[PDB]
Design a protein around this ligand. Sequence first.
Ligand SMILES: COc1ccc(-c2c(-c3cc(-c4cncc5ccccc45)c(O)cc3O)noc2NC(=O)C2CC2)cc1
Length: 208
Amino acid sequence: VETFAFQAEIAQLMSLIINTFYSNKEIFLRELISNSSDALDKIRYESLTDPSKLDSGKELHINLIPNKQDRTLTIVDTGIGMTKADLINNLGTIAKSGTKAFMEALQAGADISMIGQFGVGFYSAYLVAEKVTVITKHNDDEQYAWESSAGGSFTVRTDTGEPMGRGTKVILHLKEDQTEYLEERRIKEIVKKHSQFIGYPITLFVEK
Ligand SMILES: COc1ccc(-c2c(-c3cc(-c4cncc5ccccc45)c(O)cc3O)noc2NC(=O)C2CC2)cc1
């Protein structure tokens, strides 16, 4: 287990998201679905010239998995997946400018829902989650677990859990007052309202 500090700007953005009173929290789901869609686009495109890249799984889709017992909402995709360098360095590097621009926009009146326009929508997860754990697997690389409860640091480790074929699994450990996002009807509403134009199947797993 290695522990890292977030880039300064990103840590500041996370603090703002966590501490600003903002009722329209449902936007987190659209942003995570959008990220999955981008990752799916990437593996789809790469497979067009190298179909062996789908040996780790041909289906390109997104599953939404609420679990009231664990108080978790899981967003799983079979996209390209992330490398160790993605988790430690690249995600942060490619987000820096958008983060700075988003922070400036906020100070100048813009509202939190604009976050996705700046390419940093992931961090809206912290509107509803006290901790986010992400398992990811890129071809020809190992499975990793990323995790953060904010507060300025994240961890990365090699994951010895159940093998994913390829893709990314975002596990939102929800805040006690945010359990509405574990309800079937609510998730359906949110997906229809914000994520109706995604080129991959989105499947809601109903709890038994
Ligand atoms: C918007 O920018 C990005 C950056 C990277 C990705 C991405 C994901 C992915 C990432 C996040 C996510 C996005 N942002 C921060 C995250 C932080 C921790 C864990 C997942 C994160 C996620 O929620 C779901 C995913 O399937 N998987 O592979 C990817 N590779 C790329 O796309 C190559 C740069 C081309 C998606 C969007």
